[PDB]
């Protein structure tokens, strides 16, 4: 049944928290959550979203790890403390897009792993921009609070 | 350490000279800032033996003595049967604060034995009779107070504070 | 805030760089970067502090601990620096690099539907766009960059400058699908600019480095002796190092010219040790002064008053590398003319360098000496000379090396591309038309223990042969 | 539409200084962060988009991935250079803005102090603000409706107040700049550039090697291309107040506080300015 | 802020509104005509002319086919009958977007500046000394009405005070230069 | 019944004693004046996320809270704000325990794991429309007590 | 594995000798650095009856006891009613952690019978009567950490920290 | 006209006998009214001396000295070396204005030609070392304001005003 | 050494007979070098006159004068009533700093009487009226600098930037 912004944030943050093994990964993810929301406001969701995709340094095993996190809940995000933090915030945003039914999971994955589908993903996001920018920032604010509550500073 | 001498404000003349220090240095406890006598001491739980008042102890919380505390010493020719304390100045009362808490004081109280010969019924003594205000303005507030009438166009402005600042219970026996 | 001191300095053949590894770009010219001065100051401060802490206590502290200690003068994420650097220079006005025109409409036509390389080269004051597919064209151009023949042959004779030019002179171009002309004009003008700016190499670069002090960070617990140690390390840096790239090979070397100070209670001895270098008679006197100042930190009436704090942390010699001065490997020689010296330093650090095939005269041994000292080499036995526990013929024993088994120090020495050269070279002068090469070898914290004066024999053979 | 994207650098270089630089860089960042995808036969097949030049050049063959990465580094440097050369300063709108604002303030009976200052060294104001942040990592304090970089009035007031309480105590400051119980008596406008020499922005780099490192065995340069404000750029702002008192402390504070930093990285001599002109219009 | 290709005059920013906002303007105008025996149907006619087109993004003082607004919203526009005048009374175009998109546009159209407080001794940022503020850009336009009951004071107020009142200071942050405002009465100059 | 004012007296006693620095007391007074109105307007779960964000439940302030349950002499350590938010979170959790909305047994093995703390937040999310209606007068009393006792800074 | 021994803060004088060595080495994790007792290991679910003070293994999560983790053994004298353990030294519940840890450990717990003869009704208790903590800074904190009264000049902070940071559960059986 | 002259306040001493009248004429417009030193002027672009303390104009705007405006003329034996500035009392760069002024001044400032021999490497310097301020107040603030030690118990509020409010630049040469 | 002549830039004819060695040497400080004017000195606390127009001392930090900095003497008929001084070449506020000045300097600014008769009512005035610009252009930059109308043709930029770069506060009394 329908989960609102804070409940979806709880579920997403819970699936991320168990995957970030090293604690430095967790603290970098905290630093992510604490400012990527103001970034998304100032630069727009699509610019910041592709910035996050790039800074996640996919084009590794990190991609199948990130897609496995969607279902296994036994999966682990692998990479440096910067790469996995951006990878996990990317999982946050993808989880929102999928659960709100804005973009399907298969298309998102295939656009995330294929040179071709990425450009039409840009097209689709420019189509769906109001449906996302309407309310993604409340869910991301809840993510920010969960991060600065469940994780500490350096 | 530090010495502060405390005296009950009486209805009498029994406070002029048993102690010595009036000014001592360059700081006083109670101040006058066109606002009132600051940091007043009201010792609670005690009484007054009426004859040349010697503050009597008791277990009554409703009873208290209001009086002036200044930096001083009773020339230590007294306290042969009196009390005198030292505390870290967290357990000491003040009124309309204006000072800088010295963090350790040593006080001197007029004392009387708890008077087992008969009872000591403390009865309300509000310090009325402004002529007593005018007697004490020269018995205290100019000798041990180096500041009254110097810049003070605010004379009665703070003289009106004795009636609304001090009031105690005396045995009246 | 008020002025602390001010050091009129001078750089010799500096190779600076910003966002494009050259010292000039289409927008401004930047010969001396205050950011580089600050960074090299901090690096020399860490080196000097480990020198002191290993002389007096035989211990070595991590860099993070040392600059966490010096936070109150150099600053960190938690506190702003108390020293504000400056760099002032002549011609600090608009001095960008403009390429007015470049006539290359022809090489374009030579690059139609062909997958071919396009190398550049100056050939007797005329630059040639040598197409690797058997073609050469004398490109013509005009620029406010007046490259003299001195600079051209300084880059041609110095076999190290001509090596870092392999990445500013050559572009592979694929026009086989199709290629417009206005696009190859852009590509080739980018190539031309990246080549031309490489030759902005000045000399006699002279700049006044000011130091301002944050008064609000007055002596809290040890601010004064920290700041004094910092000024001493600034001196050490100005005397042994240089700004820019390839300072481990003589370039960018610095030279004191005048040091006016403005607060004696912090700077008296510093200004004195500085002014001692305004005129140097001959070689060994300079050597004596270098030693006097290296050991004024270790054994004079004041050495330290703060090492007794436990903010620091000992290195884990299986994890960490740290550099420090030895104060005995400091051969000095007079050179009489500086360009040929730099051209010859390549002979002193090349595997088949004729100034090394004379000093060691052995294969697999020169290789080891140049893999241990002399920065990161490209290795293709030898590690038998680099063990920790094995036959010590020439003592180049690295702390945690083990045969046929990689450990942290093993990868770090063989495969870690960014590794400074322990064997360094400095060219100094004192405003009297005399100049003394300063060769030396920093001590690394991965050497188990070396035979000092054996390597000192090697070093003096170098500094005598490299001229 | 994707066609707005693959044609945005052409827009920067043709519409120069008349394009919305904030949105321009924001959209350019999408290309920059999907470089490998915008190059796989999606250059829009034009001839003045810089994007097919990265199809002529070959930087590596043993790795398409490394090819893309080096091409992307080059493209970042080229974006910096594009913005710096093409987006110049036309400060006529700012001159009109400040003249009209000063007339408004003369009507409201303020006493205006119009201050003109000039950049001496490549400045960095707003280095953590979003402009080029999604490409460079750094930013510039950019007003997307004046389409300019600016110095916030809060920053100038904070620096002036820091100095005034430095040399007049922590009480005359609160007498001038107020506290939690009084409003300040001095108002500050943002500062905008009114005249440059040649450039408004300028590429730059910063390459930490050892910051946050333990030893030499983990040292590595990481070079950070970014944009700074060119030298010789002249900003101006206003200072207005109703009491005549506060005229004194601000006047003498202006020349002094500028020669030391007004932005970021002043410690290594970056945001060093120069009082070009000051002028006081008393009202009544 | 706007990015538009395929337009002769390039623009850095464009005025944006919605049909809902104009509906509220029209509602205020009607309601005050009922209660005041004072009509402004020049405005009403302009605004109803615009509202007739409701349901489609439209331009007023330009020929912009498409654009990207606040770098996240790609919109396509229709021109309006250029008999529609310059309500803003300027030379900048004016988009009127449908509400489900103009809402997001106008909300992202505000300036969120981050300020800090500095440790006077460390010269670094105090902990918890970082916050954001929303500003509304320069030249933003708000519409309201000033009403008055019958009186002799109301007469002098509307006839002497409200004439000589053009500039004011609104809201907070007056010392960092925010909050200056000009009041243009429709009565005076539409 | 009105025993929620009594519960508020007990909680305010424990808090007023566990805040040794008077700055922490005044900061708690501020939290009390603000957070009840924010629960009214913005709802419980949003304000609870806001509060646990600014309480910084690392591992140590957490044990101070579990002890403050039992030991009437436990103190809260940290920044004035950092402890005021944690004191208010204790107010909330105290009410939840006493009124038996969630077992204290559960709430204890949650404040010690970070792996059942998220389950604590989930549970509190399953009960937000209950708590939101219950705690109203209790938090109003806490606010009144704080304005009454603690000095305005 | 480096062995660190466990013992808590009782109030019955079952305190003095619970390890034959005092330090047995020159390492410790329970620091004292003029900032109270760092790294106070807590173990919830075990209650202590101070009469032969030992943790009774309970399954109530609320019943916690937190004491010192000294470096020692069971003296090879009390090894029947103990239970050994090798753990990665992060499965602990340390408090005020200042640095890294061995991540390898051997502890032996003061461990009483499961008390199958009665219902283990639990009693909460706190710490007051500052001499109760002084005499136990004597009883163990001399014969464990010689840095007390010899390197600590501000021990009153550790006094108030043992007073505030320590509480536990008993059975009174 | 109304005569007031400016006394430097550095840490050192050139004060004791250099001015004539204790009150001078009307009033020390620099007040002492329980809220510290008001109307303390700041001369910008000058400095003073460690000994021989006068005003030497250092054209650097980053140098400044603060002081007083005391009614009266010095000794009738100078002002061939002091400056006479008749200002309308709005060009004065005063601090902590707590009143108004007669709107026409004539300030005598202890002047001196800067130097013709050596440069001026002036030093920024604080005012501290409570013995220094305690002898300064016992040189000016008591020798200038006879309303000290007669009413002013609040000297504890003016002490920190001297300590932090006052500063200057000095030549050190 | 290198003694300097600060010739400020007023609008009246006071720049005719004021110097002896206006030649100096191979280096001035104020420059005109194909970029505009350089190294212009700004002074504060001083306001020029225009009848025997020189600087009079005043203490409104909003007063300020700008001018040129060239090597010279004060006509050897003055420096008896001028300001000679030696600055360490970093305490000089040079607008449009090009390079560095030479580590010490000797400045002669014209220092008229403090004008103790009148009262200071300084009035700001800038440079305009293009002929009043051009005549002093012919009087100063043509004479002191062999540059103008010998090295430069584009000094119309100088004409249009002096009318704004230079300004001062004056009195007209």
PDB file of N, CA, C and O in Angstrom, chain E residues 14-36:
ATOM      1  N   UNK E  14      12.830  35.774 -17.648  1.00  0.00           N
ATOM      2  CA  UNK E  14      11.511  36.136 -18.141  1.00  0.00           C
ATOM      3  C   UNK E  14      10.539  36.159 -16.971  1.00  0.00           C
ATOM      4  O   UNK E  14      10.660  35.360 -16.039  1.00  0.00           O
ATOM      5  N   UNK E  15       9.593  37.093 -17.005  1.00  0.00           N
ATOM      6  CA  UNK E  15       8.502  37.080 -16.040  1.00  0.00           C
ATOM      7  C   UNK E  15       7.637  35.848 -16.238  1.00  0.00           C
ATOM      8  O   UNK E  15       7.291  35.487 -17.362  1.00  0.00           O
ATOM      9  N   UNK E  16       7.284  35.203 -15.137  1.00  0.00           N
ATOM     10  CA  UNK E  16       6.442  34.019 -15.161  1.00  0.00           C
ATOM     11  C   UNK E  16       5.260  34.252 -14.237  1.00  0.00           C
ATOM     12  O   UNK E  16       5.401  34.871 -13.179  1.00  0.00           O
ATOM     13  N   UNK E  17       4.087  33.790 -14.657  1.00  0.00           N
ATOM     14  CA  UNK E  17       2.906  33.775 -13.815  1.00  0.00           C
ATOM     15  C   UNK E  17       2.120  32.520 -14.134  1.00  0.00           C
ATOM     16  O   UNK E  17       2.536  31.695 -14.948  1.00  0.00           O
ATOM     17  N   UNK E  18       0.982  32.363 -13.478  1.00  0.00           N
ATOM     18  CA  UNK E  18       0.093  31.252 -13.753  1.00  0.00           C
ATOM     19  C   UNK E  18      -1.311  31.791 -13.957  1.00  0.00           C
ATOM     20  O   UNK E  18      -1.598  32.957 -13.685  1.00  0.00           O
ATOM     21  N   UNK E  19      -2.188  30.925 -14.457  1.00  0.00           N
ATOM     22  CA  UNK E  19      -3.586  31.302 -14.576  1.00  0.00           C
ATOM     23  C   UNK E  19      -4.237  31.417 -13.214  1.00  0.00           C
ATOM     24  O   UNK E  19      -5.152  32.220 -13.035  1.00  0.00           O
ATOM     25  N   UNK E  20      -3.770  30.636 -12.245  1.00  0.00           N
ATOM     26  CA  UNK E  20      -4.331  30.701 -10.904  1.00  0.00           C
ATOM     27  C   UNK E  20      -4.052  32.047 -10.252  1.00  0.00           C
ATOM     28  O   UNK E  20      -4.932  32.633  -9.606  1.00  0.00           O
ATOM     29  N   UNK E  21      -2.840  32.563 -10.419  1.00  0.00           N
ATOM     30  CA  UNK E  21      -2.510  33.850  -9.825  1.00  0.00           C
ATOM     31  C   UNK E  21      -3.323  34.967 -10.451  1.00  0.00           C
ATOM     32  O   UNK E  21      -3.826  35.851  -9.748  1.00  0.00           O
ATOM     33  N   UNK E  22      -3.472  34.940 -11.773  1.00  0.00           N
ATOM     34  CA  UNK E  22      -4.317  35.921 -12.436  1.00  0.00           C
ATOM     35  C   UNK E  22      -5.771  35.768 -12.031  1.00  0.00           C
ATOM     36  O   UNK E  22      -6.498  36.760 -11.962  1.00  0.00           O
ATOM     37  N   UNK E  23      -6.212  34.540 -11.769  1.00  0.00           N
ATOM     38  CA  UNK E  23      -7.563  34.333 -11.268  1.00  0.00           C
ATOM     39  C   UNK E  23      -7.757  35.018  -9.931  1.00  0.00           C
ATOM     40  O   UNK E  23      -8.795  35.632  -9.686  1.00  0.00           O
ATOM     41  N   UNK E  24      -6.767  34.924  -9.049  1.00  0.00           N
ATOM     42  CA  UNK E  24      -6.886  35.609  -7.766  1.00  0.00           C
ATOM     43  C   UNK E  24      -6.828  37.120  -7.927  1.00  0.00           C
ATOM     44  O   UNK E  24      -7.491  37.845  -7.181  1.00  0.00           O
ATOM     45  N   UNK E  25      -6.056  37.613  -8.892  1.00  0.00           N
ATOM     46  CA  UNK E  25      -6.054  39.052  -9.156  1.00  0.00           C
ATOM     47  C   UNK E  25      -7.432  39.501  -9.618  1.00  0.00           C
ATOM     48  O   UNK E  25      -7.982  40.502  -9.140  1.00  0.00           O
ATOM     49  N   UNK E  26      -8.008  38.761 -10.562  1.00  0.00           N
ATOM     50  CA  UNK E  26      -9.339  39.067 -11.066  1.00  0.00           C
ATOM     51  C   UNK E  26     -10.381  38.976  -9.962  1.00  0.00           C
ATOM     52  O   UNK E  26     -11.321  39.775  -9.913  1.00  0.00           O
ATOM     53  N   UNK E  27     -10.224  38.009  -9.064  1.00  0.00           N
ATOM     54  CA  UNK E  27     -11.142  37.859  -7.949  1.00  0.00           C
ATOM     55  C   UNK E  27     -11.071  39.047  -7.006  1.00  0.00           C
ATOM     56  O   UNK E  27     -12.109  39.559  -6.570  1.00  0.00           O
ATOM     57  N   UNK E  28      -9.863  39.502  -6.675  1.00  0.00           N
ATOM     58  CA  UNK E  28      -9.740  40.715  -5.878  1.00  0.00           C
ATOM     59  C   UNK E  28     -10.415  41.885  -6.572  1.00  0.00           C
ATOM     60  O   UNK E  28     -11.131  42.666  -5.936  1.00  0.00           O
ATOM     61  N   UNK E  29     -10.200  42.017  -7.882  1.00  0.00           N
ATOM     62  CA  UNK E  29     -10.749  43.156  -8.609  1.00  0.00           C
ATOM     63  C   UNK E  29     -12.272  43.151  -8.589  1.00  0.00           C
ATOM     64  O   UNK E  29     -12.902  44.173  -8.295  1.00  0.00           O
ATOM     65  N   UNK E  30     -12.880  42.011  -8.908  1.00  0.00           N
ATOM     66  CA  UNK E  30     -14.331  41.898  -8.823  1.00  0.00           C
ATOM     67  C   UNK E  30     -14.826  42.237  -7.426  1.00  0.00           C
ATOM     68  O   UNK E  30     -15.712  43.089  -7.258  1.00  0.00           O
ATOM     69  N   UNK E  31     -14.263  41.582  -6.411  1.00  0.00           N
ATOM     70  CA  UNK E  31     -14.744  41.766  -5.050  1.00  0.00           C
ATOM     71  C   UNK E  31     -14.666  43.219  -4.619  1.00  0.00           C
ATOM     72  O   UNK E  31     -15.520  43.695  -3.872  1.00  0.00           O
ATOM     73  N   UNK E  32     -13.646  43.944  -5.068  1.00  0.00           N
ATOM     74  CA  UNK E  32     -13.550  45.328  -4.631  1.00  0.00           C
ATOM     75  C   UNK E  32     -14.396  46.229  -5.509  1.00  0.00           C
ATOM     76  O   UNK E  32     -14.683  47.370  -5.140  1.00  0.00           O
ATOM     77  N   UNK E  33     -14.802  45.757  -6.683  1.00  0.00           N
ATOM     78  CA  UNK E  33     -15.782  46.531  -7.431  1.00  0.00           C
ATOM     79  C   UNK E  33     -17.147  46.438  -6.773  1.00  0.00           C
ATOM     80  O   UNK E  33     -17.907  47.413  -6.765  1.00  0.00           O
ATOM     81  N   UNK E  34     -17.472  45.275  -6.203  1.00  0.00           N
ATOM     82  CA  UNK E  34     -18.768  45.128  -5.550  1.00  0.00           C
ATOM     83  C   UNK E  34     -18.903  46.059  -4.355  1.00  0.00           C
ATOM     84  O   UNK E  34     -19.971  46.633  -4.120  1.00  0.00           O
ATOM     85  N   UNK E  35     -17.834  46.230  -3.598  1.00  0.00           N
ATOM     86  CA  UNK E  35     -17.884  46.887  -2.304  1.00  0.00           C
ATOM     87  C   UNK E  35     -17.431  48.333  -2.333  1.00  0.00           C
ATOM     88  O   UNK E  35     -17.371  48.959  -1.274  1.00  0.00           O
ATOM     89  N   UNK E  36     -17.097  48.885  -3.491  1.00  0.00           N
ATOM     90  CA  UNK E  36     -16.479  50.199  -3.518  1.00  0.00           C
ATOM     91  C   UNK E  36     -17.086  51.171  -4.512  1.00  0.00           C
ATOM     92  O   UNK E  36     -16.729  52.351  -4.480  1.00  0.00           O
TER      93      UNK E  36
END
